[PDB]
Amino acid sequence: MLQPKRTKFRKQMTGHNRGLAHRGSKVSFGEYALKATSRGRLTARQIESARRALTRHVKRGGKIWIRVFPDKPVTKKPLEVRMGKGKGGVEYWVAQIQPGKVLYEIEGVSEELAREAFALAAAKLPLATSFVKRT
Amino acid sequence: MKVRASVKKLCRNCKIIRRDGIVRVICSAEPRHKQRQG
Amino acid sequence: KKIQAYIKLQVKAGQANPSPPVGPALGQHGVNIMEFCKAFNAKTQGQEPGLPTPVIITVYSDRSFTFETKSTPAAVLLKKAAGITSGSARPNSQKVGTVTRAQLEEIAKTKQADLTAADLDAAVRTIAGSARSMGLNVEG
Amino acid sequence: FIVNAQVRSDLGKGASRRLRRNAGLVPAVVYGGDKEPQSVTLELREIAKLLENEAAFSHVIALNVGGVKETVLIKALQRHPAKGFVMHADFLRVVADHKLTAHVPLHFINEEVAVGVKQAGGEISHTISEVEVSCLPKDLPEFIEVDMAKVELGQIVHLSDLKAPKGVELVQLAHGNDLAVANIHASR
Amino acid sequence: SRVAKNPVKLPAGVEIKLAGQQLSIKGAKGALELKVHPSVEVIQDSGELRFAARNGDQQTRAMAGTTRALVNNMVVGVSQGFERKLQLVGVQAKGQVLSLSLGFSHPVDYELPAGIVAETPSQTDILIKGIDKQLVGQVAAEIRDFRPPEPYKGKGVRYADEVVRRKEA
RNA sequence: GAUGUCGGCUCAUCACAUCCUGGGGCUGAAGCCGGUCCCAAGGGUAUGGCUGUUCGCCAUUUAAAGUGGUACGCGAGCUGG
RNA sequence: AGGGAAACAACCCAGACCGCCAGCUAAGGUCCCAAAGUUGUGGUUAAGUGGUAAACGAUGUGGGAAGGCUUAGACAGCUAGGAGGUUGGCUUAGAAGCAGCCACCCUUUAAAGAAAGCGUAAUAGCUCACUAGUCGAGUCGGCCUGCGCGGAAGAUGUAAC
């Protein structure tokens, strides 16, 4: 998975996920990209699962940019646990996703192979995504 | 028949038909690509 | 007009008179009889006569026969490698024959690098990728 | 390159949202260092066909508001971040004596004949297109040639390593920022 | 192009009855073909027969085409004897009933209605003759489900074509 | 200012995500067998040794010994291990 | 409190001083239970959607933008198709256009892929671009959007208008 090397604190708040993704919406490194069109939450093994789908469906070369980064820690109360005995401990990591956030980018492939590779990538992600080219 | 929630044309001989409100697939080659609803 | 591909040609080469290796093939295209068999005039001794290997043809109605810039027969002439003639039983399944690209200087007299590729090392890739799809491959 | 324009005597948020959802239009402005700015409505369908062109942004665009016609360079563009379509267009006046910075694409001409590709196994990595320039409107590069033919494996082409066509000032070279244009490197 | 604007081109030996709402086709080698032609349909006359719709629907666009097809095989069945050659194992044709012992302990007897007729031109074969292709194909299907084609060795009653999926174990 | 447990007995009632029986499709289904998936709830759907057992493990049967809801059905019906 | 949301402290409208067999409105409504439009104009929708719902899957249908294939006669359907060395490759009952291990232009001159794969688990049969004489033409592939269709199985009785 992708995790930070160390963070300043261990628990964040829950927070909210509002707005559109104005920053992070351009294909800034690659030629083709997998942009999200709905807001949600990618859990760093969704991210790695779609990553492996991409890097396994290319088979020949290319360069894949993984743009999202899970830096938000998410906790959990275990089972048979009464509520309110301090905040529960960290389990996994999460990138907060807004509509427009470019998730993955590729160059070095054809447009058809890129499109049917981001189809494999989008099959593993709980978001509504789309396919964009460089403007 | 093969009941899914996603029928597709598995080969080139497959052919998608709306029959009686059901999205079926008929294959003129292999009856294992016959599939019922989706 | 008539529009389709993966057209399927096989007869004994040169003479179209023996029919029942195929027999009544057509009944869709609609051309005449007098229009294949006058261009047997100039050149033998180059491109493997008689054995069933097809031209895969396109048609026009000018009738003064036309040959391409092409001397590569490539479809139905390459089962035998040791001298035995028939075909493979079922693909990928019956592993009994051990096969790579070893002995080629018998044919590498006339490699003919013009109609294969851009240079000679890519002509190694063509013979490294020629017959490799019913029971052989190339590492060596 | 010609787009048709209008007058736009009504400005704001809900006004702009009504232009986009009811009238099918797109707001814009025209401005230069020599005249007042002027707000303009355009059509989304009529500017989205310009944006289809590869030489859209590095080119003279005639622009007709009434019977008044202006020469116009598109120097800004706003775009809906999720769906992706033009909101307000934000373009610039063009005068014949003016410095006129625009973005020009890179075009990466002969990549099959690359000595880090054919003999040595490697792939071309374009890190940058859309170079910003600084040029009079007389010389507008619709493209900038990037020759990638005599470049070996592991070698990098920078902004100094290519051509500035007939008085075109590449902006980052005028600083100490010699950016990496393209790249030839080993595969994965 | 679309098929309802393709005219019928009936021969001289099809003496039709225009009635305004339903067509009634008579002739030699079979006759008495009546069809209640639907409301969204036009039946006009010339030296040949032809069809057109009435209103801008996608439902009648299928109906004019099927009405041309129904009268096409109706006319050409009033003219010619619609056939089928079903190949089977063992056929003792005797009369208006058919007798066949398809691998069971009982020979299942199949009777033939008015219209259709079955013959015994060979040892393993049935030729059918009828005036509408509807009932010809229906009685061919009614023979066919007595014993469908087993793939492995190959038994049962077939059609005239050979597209039967065969497998080996 | 009381809605008295688990199990067994007795009596049930519904669902269907069907255990048998019935009808099919595909098959890597030659046939006896199967595997899986549809359709179907009409009727059926063990006796025991151990332990308080539910369960479980065995023994022997059956065409089969289905899965669940009903105050984990049922003590103003019984028991009380 | 009253009216509406079937029933429903807290939701909507509205704050009951008392009487009236007077009127006008709010929310919500106007086919019958049940008071008021079986009102008008233009559409959409065939699921009883309305009147339960997600990933995803569908020639369901309405609308609006665009491309090229568009009569020198297109998208599926009838009257030739079919080579000028050689055994073009570690294999020896049998390794051509689907094995662990891959693929781009020199003929006699109007003709065309050393193959994206179903055949007689394989040989001797045969479905995909046609530089055309031939039937005579208006159709094919994606985007945005309206409403719909499957995905959708439970227990006393229709039983989520």
Side-chain angles (χ1 to χ4, degrees), chain A, chain B residues 1-29 31-38, chain C, chain D residues 1-50 55-147 149 151 153-176 178-187, chain E residues 1-36 38-160 164-169:
Chain A
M1 294 73 168
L2 289 171
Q3 304 179 1
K5 60 176 72 174
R6 91 292 197 283
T7 59
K8 185 164 68 178
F9 300 99
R10 294 174 64 185
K11 301 178 185 181
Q12 287 188 357
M13 298 314 196
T14 297
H16 289 281
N17 191 6
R18 292 184 179 96
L20 297 175
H22 296 91
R23 299 292 298 273
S25 64
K26 285 93 175 66
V27 188
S28 298
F29 299 101
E31 187 67 26
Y32 306 102
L34 183 64
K35 182 187 284 185
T37 61
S38 68
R39 76 185 71 252
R41 168 167 285 183
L42 295 179
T43 195
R45 64 181 67 193
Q46 293 164 1
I47 298 173
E48 179 59 32
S49 179
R51 202 277 307 163
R52 283 195 292 262
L54 289 171
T55 62
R56 189 176 58 238
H57 191 270
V58 289
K59 291 182 177 67
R60 179 67 175 84
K63 186 170 172 69
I64 297 172
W65 287 268
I66 301 99
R67 297 287 305 279
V68 292
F69 185 72
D71 56 351
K72 178 178 172 68
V74 175
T75 72
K76 180 73 178 177
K77 293 287 182 66
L79 279 77
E80 187 64 28
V81 169
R82 297 292 175 89
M83 297 188 68
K85 290 289 182 183
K87 186 176 183 176
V90 66
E91 283 286 326
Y92 58 90
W93 293 88
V94 150
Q96 283 185 352
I97 303 303
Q98 292 167 350
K101 178 70 173 175
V102 172
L103 308 178
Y104 301 102
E105 293 181 0
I106 194 165
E107 74 175 0
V109 294
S110 179
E111 196 271 337
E112 289 85 2
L113 185 63
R115 190 179 292 271
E116 67 189 4
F118 294 124
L120 268 298
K124 268 68 187 300
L125 294 180
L127 301 169
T129 65
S130 70
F131 182 75
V132 295
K133 298 179 292 297
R134 174 174 292 276
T135 59
Chain B
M1 285 290 177
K2 183 185 290 183
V3 180
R4 299 285 293 273
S6 68
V7 296
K8 290 187 285 186
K9 286 189 177 184
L10 295 172
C11 65
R12 64 187 183 273
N13 296 115
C14 295
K15 185 178 183 290
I16 298 171
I17 279 93
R18 186 177 178 87
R19 186 183 292 166
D20 202 0
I22 311 300
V23 183
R24 299 177 183 271
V25 177
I26 302 169
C27 187
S28 297
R32 65 175 70 193
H33 294 171
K34 190 197 294 180
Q35 51 193 352
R36 202 266 300 282
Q37 61 90 25
Chain C
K1 286 175 183 177
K2 275 74 177 175
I3 302 298
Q4 76 269 19
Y6 163 82
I7 62 171
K8 291 162 260 75
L9 300 179
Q10 180 174 2
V11 81
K12 295 297 289 183
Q15 295 303 111
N17 200 2
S19 294
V22 281
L26 283 189
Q28 59 87 25
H29 204 194
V31 195
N32 288 312
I33 300 299
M34 197 70 75
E35 290 83 4
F36 180 66
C37 300
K38 291 185 175 70
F40 192 66
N41 295 322
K43 288 176 93 287
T44 58
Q45 203 179 4
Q47 273 65 232
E48 191 178 359
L51 288 179
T53 304
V55 188
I56 292 94
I57 198 65
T58 316
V59 64
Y60 193 76
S61 296
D62 200 5
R63 284 86 178 87
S64 66
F65 294 100
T66 307
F67 293 159
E68 283 289 321
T69 64
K70 188 259 187 181
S71 68
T72 304
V76 198
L77 69 99
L78 70 165
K79 295 309 289 183
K80 76 278 287 177
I84 60 170
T85 63
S86 298
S88 299
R90 185 172 174 87
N92 307 114
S93 296
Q94 191 170 4
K95 294 280 189 175
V96 71
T98 303
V99 275
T100 57
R101 192 269 312 278
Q103 192 269 337
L104 200 275
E105 196 176 1
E106 187 72 30
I107 311 298
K109 295 178 173 67
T110 61
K111 284 294 288 185
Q112 295 177 355
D114 194 357
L115 281 165
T116 187
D119 55 351
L120 192 65
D121 287 329
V124 178
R125 192 180 181 182
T126 59
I127 55 168
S130 294
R132 284 179 49 179
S133 299
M134 59 183 71
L136 53 82
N137 279 307
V138 174
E139 282 187 354
Chain D
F1 286 161
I2 175 67
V3 280
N4 297 321
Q6 287 85 13
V7 185
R8 197 187 173 195
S9 176
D10 186 66
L11 305 173
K13 181 186 285 190
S16 301
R17 295 191 176 189
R18 280 193 293 271
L19 262 70
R20 293 180 181 97
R21 78 179 189 272
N22 297 324
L25 297 180
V26 165
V29 281
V30 207
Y31 56 89
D34 287 328
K35 292 172 70 173
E36 284 289 326
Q38 187 179 6
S39 298
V40 155
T41 71
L42 302 176
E43 288 82 8
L44 182 59
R45 182 184 53 83
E46 202 267 334
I47 195 70
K49 193 183 287 187
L50 282 196
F57 302 99
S58 65
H59 195 276
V60 158
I61 289 168
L63 189 137
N64 202 3
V65 179
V68 283
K69 297 183 100 292
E70 285 83 4
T71 300
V72 156
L73 192 277
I74 299 175
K75 191 173 177 63
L77 191 61
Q78 192 153 352
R79 192 177 288 276
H80 190 79
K83 296 177 76 70
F85 54 89
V86 178
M87 49 190 65
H88 100 297
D90 195 357
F91 35 69
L92 175 65
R93 261 67 167 267
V94 177
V95 192
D97 51 356
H98 192 268
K99 188 60 74 69
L100 189 62
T101 60
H103 291 91
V104 176
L106 298 174
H107 277 262
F108 292 138
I109 46 168
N110 47 3
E111 290 172 345
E112 190 179 4
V113 282
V115 301
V117 171
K118 296 290 283 186
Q119 297 87 15
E123 298 177 355
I124 306 102
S125 176
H126 315 109
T127 61
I128 282 169
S129 180
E130 292 184 355
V131 60
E132 61 173 0
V133 299
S134 176
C135 62
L136 292 170
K138 183 59 68 180
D139 43 350
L140 289 174
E142 296 181 356
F143 66 97
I144 286 174
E145 175 185 359
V146 177
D147 195 0
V151 286
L153 193 277
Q155 196 271 339
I156 300 99
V157 51
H158 295 89
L159 285 177
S160 297
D161 298 328
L162 74 156
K163 183 173 72 175
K166 189 178 166 63
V168 169
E169 179 71 30
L170 300 175
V171 175
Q172 299 293 322
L173 286 173
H175 301 289
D178 194 357
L179 271 58
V181 177
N183 207 167
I184 305 98
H185 67 91
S187 66
Chain E
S1 66
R2 189 260 186 89
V3 302
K5 65 180 288 294
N6 194 1
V8 177
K9 194 174 182 177
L10 77 163
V14 179
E15 178 58 34
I16 65 169
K17 185 187 287 186
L18 292 172
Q21 182 63 253
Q22 57 86 21
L23 187 60
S24 181
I25 294 174
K26 196 189 267 85
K29 188 65 182 294
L32 278 305
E33 291 292 324
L34 195 147
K35 181 169 68 68
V36 179
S39 62
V40 284
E41 194 69 29
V42 177
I43 306 98
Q44 71 272 15
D45 53 357
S46 68
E48 58 190 1
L49 289 172
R50 193 184 180 274
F51 291 90
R54 290 189 177 184
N55 55 7
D57 293 333
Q58 201 68 39
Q59 294 87 24
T60 185
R61 194 182 297 270
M63 194 64 210
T66 191
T67 300
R68 189 262 175 192
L70 285 178
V71 305
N72 189 6
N73 57 13
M74 192 177 290
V75 166
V76 84
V78 168
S79 181
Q80 286 85 19
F82 279 123
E83 68 180 1
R84 182 69 63 194
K85 189 184 285 185
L86 299 175
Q87 56 184 358
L88 75 166
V89 46
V91 46
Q92 293 297 320
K94 61 176 292 299
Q96 191 65 45
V97 296
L98 181 60
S99 297
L100 46 86
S101 180
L102 290 176
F104 292 169
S105 294
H106 67 283
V108 47
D109 289 332
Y110 179 77
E111 67 182 3
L112 295 167
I116 207 68
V117 62
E119 286 83 11
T120 171
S122 294
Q123 190 181 6
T124 182
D125 296 326
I126 292 170
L127 186 68
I128 207 72
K129 285 175 183 173
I131 61 170
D132 56 344
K133 193 168 78 77
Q134 170 71 48
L135 202 149
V136 167
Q138 182 64 51
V139 300
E142 289 181 359
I143 293 170
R144 188 183 184 272
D145 61 354
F146 279 158
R147 185 78 274 280
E150 182 183 359
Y152 292 107
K153 181 176 170 66
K155 289 187 71 170
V157 52
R158 308 286 182 87
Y159 283 165
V164 48
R165 170 63 178 268
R166 189 171 183 86
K167 296 184 176 71
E168 295 178 356

